[PDB]
Amino acid sequence: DVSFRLSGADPSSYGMFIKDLRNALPHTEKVYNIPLLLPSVSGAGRYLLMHLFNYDGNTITVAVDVTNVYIMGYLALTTSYFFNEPAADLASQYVFRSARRKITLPYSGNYERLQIAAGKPREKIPIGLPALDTAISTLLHYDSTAAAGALLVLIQTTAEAARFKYIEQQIQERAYRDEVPSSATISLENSWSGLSKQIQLAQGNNGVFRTPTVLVDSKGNRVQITNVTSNVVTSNIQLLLNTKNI
Ligand SMILES: *[C@@H]1O[C@H](CO)[C@@H](O)[C@H](O)[C@H]1NC(C)=O
């Protein structure tokens, strides 16, 4: 398992937690020095448990599929919660079985359905360590509308930070003050699978992308990524979605 405590949290302890999260995901190869996530994992070992503690020490346990870093559901006291999708239904077979009751959230775990549920797009939800402390607190007591926004914060400050150093850094900058994510952060989030694909494809194509990826840069400019010499590949993405899951 991995764990993170908001009480006494700082940019360094967050960085350490995000490093553990990445290191709990299994892989058998690197592609251009980037861990390549497995095509699949059988049984319960498919699911990493992340124990998060809010500032008062209250906890939820979040279940993550180690193949794609998708959050499946979480446990809050004796109640489990899962997204309304087949993958999460599958996960509920394996984790949080000892929960007294299971609630299925009235949405699937993707950004489009979560933004609908929450009534706002990601671009307008500030994120950061304080927003994470709030999200953990909210998820402690069921409220489906509030939970959608909480889950958008949670996904971004855990899974999206593990995938990209740039997002991990953005969260670090927001250790003590939340702020909406930069368009770059949104761009990376949206492009993870495509980048993961083009990096794998580059092996066999001399480090060149079969199709270039358009991102937005740190300065708000459109940039086009064409090959594995880009900083995005050398010094940003930390985990690749296996092309068998694309
Ligand atoms: C690849 O990426 C670099 C950095 O983005 C770019 O300037 C360069 O011209 C590209 N090279 C090729 C061979 O496509």
UniProtKB/TrEMBL annotation:
Amino-acid positions noted as binding CTP in the UniProt annotation, renumbered to this chain: 70-71, 85, 110-112, 122, 160, 163
Binding locations of CDP: 70-71, 85, 110-112, 163
Binding positions (cytidine): 70-71, 85, 111, 160, 163
Glycosylation sites: 227
Pfam family, one: RIP
Positions that bind guanine: 71, 109, 160, 163
Binding site for adenine 1: 70-71, 109
Residues noted as binding adenine 2 in the record, renumbered to the chain: 71, 109
A GO biological-process term: negative regulation of translation
Protein name per its UniProtKB record: rRNA N-glycosylase
